[PDB]
Design a binder for this molecule. Structure first.
Ligand SMILES: CCCCCCCCCCCC(=O)SCCNC(=O)CCNC(=O)[C@H](O)C(C)(C)COP(=O)(O)O
Ligand code: SF4
Ligand code: SF4
Lengths: 208, 176, 88, 386, 112, 115
C-alpha cells in the first residue's frame, strides 16, 4: 500500500468525528445520524423540520462559522418512500472545513426555503424545483430556471426518460416552431454493463 | 502568502501634485496608449496566408476518421465492437457476420460524424489499430447526409490517407 | 350630474340582460328565481364566469366568499342592492 | 412604469445565450432578471448513462474556456472515490497545464471584458498567445481545447519530446504581453472611469451569496483553495494571492492581471521541477495498460477489454470535491452506487451563484455599468446551464 | 487607530474592548434563560467566558487579536453579534429536546 | 390520522377556492394574451382552452395535489403575463401540426401495433 494507494489522514478524521458528536449533542431534536467517510468528509442526517434551525446554527455558532453555501442539490432514489434526498454542502473559512447536511422529502411535502439563511440558496432551490419537483415553502420567487417555458415534467427524476416526450421543429404551414411527440431515427442503445461478479466485499449486504 | 493590488498612496509634495496636474491637463497616459498602438502598427503581423499556408499540427492531431488495412490489403478490423462500446456519443454502429472464408469481419461500420465529438476514444480502444482519427480536417459538406459515413466511405478514407496515417502512427506509437 | 339613483328594478333588468348573454343559459326559461346548478345545469366554473360578468357590468369586485353564496339571479340582485345601498 | 428590455440572447455583450430581462427607468437599471437555460443540455442526466471515462469529456464542455481544470476536478473526485493516487509526474503535468489553462481563461476574461467596455485592441494581441497555448494543448493531446487529457488515475499520454522547451520559450515572453495590456488599460482614465466603484460588493454579502474566487478576493477576503485546501502538488509551488480593497470592477481586473503573473511564476517552478516516471497509476484495474503490453500479455488484454467496455467499478459513496478553477470554486458532488456508471453527478459552477448575484450588484447603476458588471463576473454559460 | 479592516463593508471599530464586553455579557444573559442541561448553553457559555476573560486580560488590540484566534477584532465583534442572534433563535427553537421523529426504515441505506 | 403536512390548504374547500382564484385570473388574462401575442384565435377559443386544461384535472381528490396544480398554473400564468412565453409556447396548447390520432379499435388495428 504505497504509491498506488491514496494516503489516509487520521488527524482530520478524528477532528471531524469529534465535531460531528458536538453538533449531534447540541441539536438532538433534529439530528438523526452522523457519519465520517474514509476520505474525511462529515455528513449530518437530519429530520426535515430542522433544515432552518440546523443551517442557521452551522452559520452563526462561534465554533462552526460555516458562512459559505457551496452547493445545494437533490438526489432521486425511487425505492424510498421519501423519494428525494436534499443535500447542502457548506464551507467554513474560519476553520478551513467542509460539512454536508442531508434531509429527505417526497413528492407532496414542502421543504422550508433557506434563503433567509443563505441567499445563494435561491437559484439552487429553483433548480431543484425545476429538476425534481420539490416545492420550497416561503421561497421569494419560485419558478423554472433551466427548462423551456411551458415544459412539463421534472427531467432529473429517474423515471423521466432521457430524450423526454416532445421534440421541436420549424413548421412552415403555421410559420413557427412547434412541439411534437419525439421520434428518433436511431434509438439510444441501452447497454447492460454490470458484471455478474461482486466487486467490493466490504459493501456486501445481508442476503435477507 | 498574499499581496495588495490597490493599496498605494500618492505623495503630496508640490512636485508630485504638479506632475499629476500636468497629467490631468495634458493627457500623458492617453498619449502613452497611443504610443503603444503606434508601436504595434510597425510590427510584423501574425497572419498566415491561408490556404497557401497552414497552421502547425501534431502527429497526435485528431481529424477525419479512417479504417486501416494490413500490408497485404486485408482489413485490420475484426468486429470486436470495443470502439462502439466506448464511444461517448454512440456515434458508431457495427454489424458483423462470418465472411465467406470464415473470417470475423464487419458488414456495417457507420460513424455519424454529426454525433461524433472527435475524442479519439475509439482509436485508443481499438486493439488492432483499425479505426483511427486521421490528419484531415477540411471535409465540410453542403448537406447533412454526406456526414453519415458508412464502411465504404471509411475504407476509402483509409486508402486515401494511409501514407500520412502510417507516418503519424510511427511518430506517436512509442507514447501509447 | 352623476349617475341616476339606480333602483332594484334597474338592477334586476341589467342582471337579466347580463345573464341572457351567457351561451349556456336558455334565454326564455330563465327567471329571477332560477338556480344555476339545479335548473340551468351550470357547473361551478360556469357560476364563476357569471359572477365575473356581473363584476364587469356593475363595475365593482365581488370576493370569492360572497360570490359562492350567489346561486340565483335574485341573490345577485340582493347582493348588488345591499352593496350599492338601494332600497327601491 | 419602467421600460422592459430583452438584453440578449442575440446581443454582443450577452455571450450568446443569456437573455436578461431588464426593467429600466431611462437608462437606470431598476431590476435585473437573468433568464438562463438557453444552453441547458441536460449534462447531469446524460452522465448517468455513461461510464466514468465516457463521462469525462462532458467536463471539457462545461467551462469551455478552462478545459483541463474541469478535467482535473472530475479526475480528483473519481480518484478520491477509488481510493487511488495519481503518480507524481502526472500531478506535476496536471498543475502545469492547469496554470496554462488559468492563463487562457484570464486572457479571455480580461480581453472580452475590455471589448464590452469598448477597448477592442488587446483582444487581438492576447488571442495570438491563446493560439500558441492552444498548440501546447494540441501537441499534448491532439485537440486544441477539448483535450480530455486529464483522466482519473493521471494523464492519458506523456509529454512529447521538446514540449517543455517550447513552453519555456512562450513563458519567458508572456510577461511583456501582460505589460502591454496593462499599459493600455491599468492607468487609463477612461478605463478607470468605467471600472472604479462599479459593482461594489461587501465581503459579508459575497460570502452569503455563494461567491468564490476573485469575486471574494476583490472584496478583501483572503481565501484561495490552492493555498487553504491544496490538491495534487500545489503545496510545493510558491505564489502570491492578489487581494483587492474596494470590491469593484477595477480591483477585480487588477487581481486577474496579477493572477496571470503569479501563474507565470508557478509555470516556471513546474517546468524546473518536473520529475521522471510513469504518467498514470500503475493499476490496470483502473488505468489501461500500455498498448505494447495489451498486445503481448493475457492480463493486459483482459483489462484493456474490460476497462474499455464495462469500465472500472467505483466503490459506493458520495464526495464533494472542489478546486480553485480560474472562475472560482468548481465542484462536483459525485454519488457512486458501486457500479461502473455514476449514480448522480451534480456540478457546482461558480458562475451560477455569481450570476444570481447580478441583480444585487447592479443596484443604482446604468446600462453600461451592467455590461461592465457582466464582464467582471466572468460568466461562461456552459457551466451555468450544464 | 487602524486605518481600515481591509474588508469591504466592515467599518473600523473604535473602543472594541467595550463593545466585546457588552456583547459577551448580553450573550450570557440570553443563555441564562436556556435550560441548564442543554448542551448549547454550556458549550456557548464556556467559549463566551473564555473570550470575555481573554478580552479583560489584554488591553492591546493587536495582542488581543492574536490571542482570540478570531481574525481582526471587528470580525470578532461581528461573530459575537451573530452568536447573540443565534442564541435568541435557539431559545425560540428549543433544539435541546428529543428527536421529533425517526426516519423510515431504509431512509439512509446506501446503496439502495 | 395519516399525519400529512399541508402545502396551502387543509381540506378540499380551500383548495377549490384557490382553484377558483386561478381560474378567474386566467379568464381575465386571456383577452390580453390574444391582443399582445397577436394570435389568430378568438377570445372564446382561448377561454375554451383554459376551461379544457382545468377540466383535465377535475378527477383529483387530494388537496396537496390540487395545491401543487394551482402552483403550476400560477407559474404558467406569470410566464404568460410577462411575455416570457413566445407565440410558439402559447400555441403549443392547441397542437395544430399533429395529425388526428384515431381512437376506435379498427383504425388503430389498421395503422399499427400500438394498443
Ligand atoms: C391560451 C392557452 C393557455 C393555457 C393555460 C393552461 C393553464 C392550466 C392550469 C391548470 C390548473 C389546474 O390544474 S388546478 C386543479 C384542478 N382542480 C381539481 O382537480 C379539484 C377537484 N375537481 C373540481 O373541483 C371540479 O372538477 C372543477 C372542474 C375544478 C370545478 O369544481 P366545482 O364545479 O365544484 O366548482
Ligand atoms: S472520436 Fe469519440 S465520439 Fe467520435 S467515433 Fe471515436 S469514440 Fe465516438
Ligand atoms: S474498429 Fe477496432 S475496436 Fe472497432 S470493431 Fe473494428 S477492431 Fe474492434
Amino acid at each position: 500500500t504505497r504509491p498506488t494507494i491514496r494516503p489516509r489522514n487520521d488527524v482530520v478524521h478524528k477532528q471531524l468525528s469529534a465535531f460531528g458528536q458536538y453538533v449531534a449533542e447540541i441539536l438532538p431534536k433534529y439530528v438523526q445520524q452522523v457519519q465520517v467517510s474514509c476520505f474525511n468528509e462529515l455528513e449530518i442526517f437530519i429530520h426535515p423540520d430542522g433544515v432552518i434551525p440546523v443551517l442557521t446554527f452551522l452559520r452563526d455558532h462561534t465554533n462552526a462559522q460555516f458562512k459559505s453555501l457551496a452547493d445545494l442539490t437533490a438526489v432521486d432514489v425511487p425505492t424510498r418512500q421519501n423519494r428525494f434526498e436534499i443535500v447542502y454542502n457548506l464551507l467554513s473559512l474560519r476553520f478551513n472545513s467542509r460539512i454536508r447536511v442531508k434531509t429527505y422529502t417526497d413528492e407532496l411535502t414542502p421543504i422550508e426555503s433557506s434563503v433567509t439563511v443563505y441567499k445563494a440558496a435561491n437559484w439552487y432551490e429553483r433548480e431543484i424545483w425545476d429538476m425534481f419537483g420539490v416545492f420550497f415553502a416561503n421561497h421569494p420567487d419560485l419558478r423554472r430556471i433551466l427548462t423551456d417555458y411551458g415544459f412539463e415534467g421534472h427531467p432529473f427524476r429517474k423515471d423521466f426518460p432521457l430524450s423526454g416526450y416532445v421534440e421541436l421543429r420549424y413548421d412552415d404551414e403555421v410559420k413557427r416552431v412547434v412541439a411534437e411527440p419525439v421520434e428518433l431515427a436511431q434509438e439510444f442503445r441501452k447497454f447492460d454493463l454490470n458484471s455478474p461478479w461482486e466487486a467490493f466485499p466490504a459493501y456486501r449486504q445481508p442476503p435477507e | 502568502t498574499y499581496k495588495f493590488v490597490n493599496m498605494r498612496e500618492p505623495s503630496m509634495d508640490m512636485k508630485s501634485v504638479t506632475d499629476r496636474a500636468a497629467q490631468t491637463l495634458l493627457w500623458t497616459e492617453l498619449v502613452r496608449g497611443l504610443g503603444m498602438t503606434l508601436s504595434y502598427l510597425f510590427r510584423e503581423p501574425a497572419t498566415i496566408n491561408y490556404p497557401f499556408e497552414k497552421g502547425p499540427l501534431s502527429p497526435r492531431f485528431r481529424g477525419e476518421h479512417a479504417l486501416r488495412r494490413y500490408p497485404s490489403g486485408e482489413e485490420r478490423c475484426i468486429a470486436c465492437k470495443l470502439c462502439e462500446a466506448v464511444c461517448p456519443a454512440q456515434a458508431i454502429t457495427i454489424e458483423a457476420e462470418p465472411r465467406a472464408d470464415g473470417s470475423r469481419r464487419t458488414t456495417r461500420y457507420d460513424i455519424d460524424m454529426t454525433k461524433c465529438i472527435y475524442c479519439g476514444f475509439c482509436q485508443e480502444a481499438c486493439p488492432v489499430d483499425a479505426i483511427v482519427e486521421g490528419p484531415n480536417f477540411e471535409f465540410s459538406t453542403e448537406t447533412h447526409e454526406e456526414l453519415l459515413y458508412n464502411k465504404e466511405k471509411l475504407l476509402n478514407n483509409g486508402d486515401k490517407w494511409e501514407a500520412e496515417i502510417a507516418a503519424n502512427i510511427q511518430a506517436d506509437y512509442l507514447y501509447r | 350630474s352623476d349617475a341616476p339613483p339606480l333602483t332594484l328594478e334597474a338592477i334586476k333588468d341589467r342582471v337579466l340582460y347580463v345573464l341572457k348573454l351567457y351561451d349556456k343559459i336558455d334565454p326564455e326559461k330563465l327567471s329571477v328565481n332560477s338556480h344555476f346548478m339545479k335548473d340551468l345545469g351550470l357547473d361551478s366554473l360556469d357560476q364563476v364566469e357569471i359572477i365575473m360578468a356581473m363584476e364587469d357590468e356593475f363595475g365593482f369586485e365581488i370576493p370569492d366568499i360572497d360570490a359562492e353564496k350567489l346561486m340565483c339571479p335574485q341573490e345577485i340582485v340582493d347582493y348588488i342592492a345591499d352593496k350599492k345601498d338601494v332600497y327601491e | 412604469s419602467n421600460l422592459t428590455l430583452n438584453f440578449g440572447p442575440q446581443h454582443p455583450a450577452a455571450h450568446g445565450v443569456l437573455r436578461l430581462v431588464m426593467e429600466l427607468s431611462g437608462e437606470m437599471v431598476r431590476k435585473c432578471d437573468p433568464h438562463i437555460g438557453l444552453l441547458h443540455r441536460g449534462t447531469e442526466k446524460l452522465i448517468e448513462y455513461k461510464t466514468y471515462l465516457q463521462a469525462l469529456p462532458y467536463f471539457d464542455r462545461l467551462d469551455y474556456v478552462s478545459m483541463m481544470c474541469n478535467e482535473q476536478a472530475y479526475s480528483l473526485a473519481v480518484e478520491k472515490l477509488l481510493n487511488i493516487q495519481p503518480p507524481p509526474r502526472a500531478q506535476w503535468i496536471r498543475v502545469l497545464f492547469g496554470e496554462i489553462t488559468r492563463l487562457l481563461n484570464h486572457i479571455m476574461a480580461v480581453t472580452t471584458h475590455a471589448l464590452d467596455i469598448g477597448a477592442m485592441t488587446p483582444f487581438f494581441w492576447m488571442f495570438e498567445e491563446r493560439e500558441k497555448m492552444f498548440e501546447f494543448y494540441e501537441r499534448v493531446s491532439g485537440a486544441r481545447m477539448h483535450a480530455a487529457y486529464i483522466r482519473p488515475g493521471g494523464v492519458h499520454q506523456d509529454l512529447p519530446l521538446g514540449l517543455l522547451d517550447d513552453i519555456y520559450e512562450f513563458s519567458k515572453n508572456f510577461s511583456f504581453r501582460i505589460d502591454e495590456l496593462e499599459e493600455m488599460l491599468t492607468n487609463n482614465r477612461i478605463w478607470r472611469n468605467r471600472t472604479v466603484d462599479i459593482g461594489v460588493v461587501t465581503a459579508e454579502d459575497a460570502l452569503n451569496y455563494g461567491f468564490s474566487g476573485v469575486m471574494l478576493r476583490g472584496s478583501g477576503i483572503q481565501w484561495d483553495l490552492r493555498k487553504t485546501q491544496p490538491y495534487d502538488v500545489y503545496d510545493q509551488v510558491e505564489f502570491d494571492v492578489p487581494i483587492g480593497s474596494r470590491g469593484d470592477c477595477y480591483d477585480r481586473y487588477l487581481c486577474r492581471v496579477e493572477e496571470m503573473r503569479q501563474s507565470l511564476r508557478i509555470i516556471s517552478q513546474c517546468l524546473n521541477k518536473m520529475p521522471p516516471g510513469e504518467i498514470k497509476v500503475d493499476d490496470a484495474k483502473v488505468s489501461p495498460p500500455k498498448r505494447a503490453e495489451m498486445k503481448t500479455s493475457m492480463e493486459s488484454l483482459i483489462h484493456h477489454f474490460k476497462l474499455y467496455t464495462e469500465g472500472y467499478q467505483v466503490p459506493p459513496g458520495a464526495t464533494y470535491t472542489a478546486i480553485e478553477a480560474p472562475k472560482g470554486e468548481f465542484g462536483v458532488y459525485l454519488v457512486s452506487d458501486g457500479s461502473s456508471r455514476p449514480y448522480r453527478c451534480k456540478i457546482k459552477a461558480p458562475g451560477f451563484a455569481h450570476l444570481a448575484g447580478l441583480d444585487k450588484m447592479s443596484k443604482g447603476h446604468m446600462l453600461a455599468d451592467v455590461v461592465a458588471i457582466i464582464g467582471t463576473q466572468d460568466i461562461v454559460f456552459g457551466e451555468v446551464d450544464r | 487607530l487602524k486605518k481600515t479592516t481591509g474588508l469591504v463593508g466592515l467599518a473600523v471599530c473604535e473602543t472594541p474592548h467595550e463593545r466585546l464586553k457588552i456583547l459577551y455579557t448580553k450573550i450570557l444573559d440570553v443563555l441564562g434563560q436556556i435550560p441548564k442541561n442543554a448542551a448549547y448553553r454550556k458549550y456557548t457559555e464556556q467559549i463566551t467566558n473564555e473570550k470575555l476573560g481573554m478580552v479583560k486580560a489584554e488591553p492591546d488590540v493587536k495582542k488581543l487579536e492574536e490571542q482570540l484566534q478570531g481574525g481582526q477584532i471587528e470580525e470578532v465583534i461581528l461573530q459575537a453579534e451573530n452568536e447573540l442572534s443565534l442564541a435568541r433563535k435557539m431559545l425560540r427553537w428549543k433544539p435541546w429536546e428529543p428527536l421529533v421523529e425517526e426516519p423510515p426504515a431504509n431512509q439512509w441505506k446506501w446503496p439502495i | 390520522g395519516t399525519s400529512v403536512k399541508p402545502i396551502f390548504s387543509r381540506d378540499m374547500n380551500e383548495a377549490k377556492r384557490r382553484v377558483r382564484e386561478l381560474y378567474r385570473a386566467w379568464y381575465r388574462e386571456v383577452p390580453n394574451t390574444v391582443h399582445l401575442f397577436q394570435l389568430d384565435i378568438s377570445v372564446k377559443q382561448g377561454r375554451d382552452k383554459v376551461r379544457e386544461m382545468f377540466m383535465k384535472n377535475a378527477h383529483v381528490t387530494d388537496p396537496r395535489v390540487v395545491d401543487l396544480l394551482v402552483i403550476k398554473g400560477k407559474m404558467e400564468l406569470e410566464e404568460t403575463i410577462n411575455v416570457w412565453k413566445q407565440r410558439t409556447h402559447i400555441m403549443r396548447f392547441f397542437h395544430e401540426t399533429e395529425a388526428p390520432r384515431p381512437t376506435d379499435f379498427l383504425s388503430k388495428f389498421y395503422v399499427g401495433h400500438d394498443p
